[PDB]
């Protein structure tokens, strides 16, 4: 009833570093990547940084339909730019966007996460 | 390891998108020039032709004075229903400077989660 779908993209600065955030919640339809995706590549694309890597709190999202246009998303930067570092923030148990969600994003490093305190830890320094 | 920015998002309630946009710390004029480009390239992707906003400022301290987020207007391509301004703060510390930002039918502000988003989706 009162369940949210979607997804947030920001950025927010941490002991005077700023990064890319990213929060996706629920479960993801079709007419959601429709609806939400020209947003997100809208954002990203005048994100402008000499260095700049992502925080995905993916803790609150469900998934995506069997074989939906979500597999295939690609999210990219400014000026072909690569994200440093990519923390993609999960739970304690599998879930299925897990080996999937990381393919959004070209990133020199990608790691995995259960702890936010974490997540940020190896973002920042 | 306190953070300060903005997030800008679309979500779904049963069947009703809504834009989403989230405000935290102490917004500095070094962040205006980085967020607020983001922040007007993802505005200006919302096709969505009856469309309200969630304001959520719960988390926010506030701002530089001097910075150009005083002035700050965002808009769509178009115009907001309503916005749902949510806060724990006195409404005149920050809610009404930030409600400011936008144009709307309505501008609420709220302290319940809610009540906030049942206000917008009716």
Redesign the interface.
Known sequence: ???????????????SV?FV?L?A??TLTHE?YL??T????????????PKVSLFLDATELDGWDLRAAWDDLKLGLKHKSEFERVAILGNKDWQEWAAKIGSWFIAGEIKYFEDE?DA??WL?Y
């Open positions: 009833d009162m369940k949210k779908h979607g997804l947030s993209i920001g950025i927010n600065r941490i002991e700023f955030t929060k919640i629920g959601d609806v939400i020209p947003m997100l590549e809208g954002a990203l694309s005048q994100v402008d940084q305190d940020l830890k920042r």
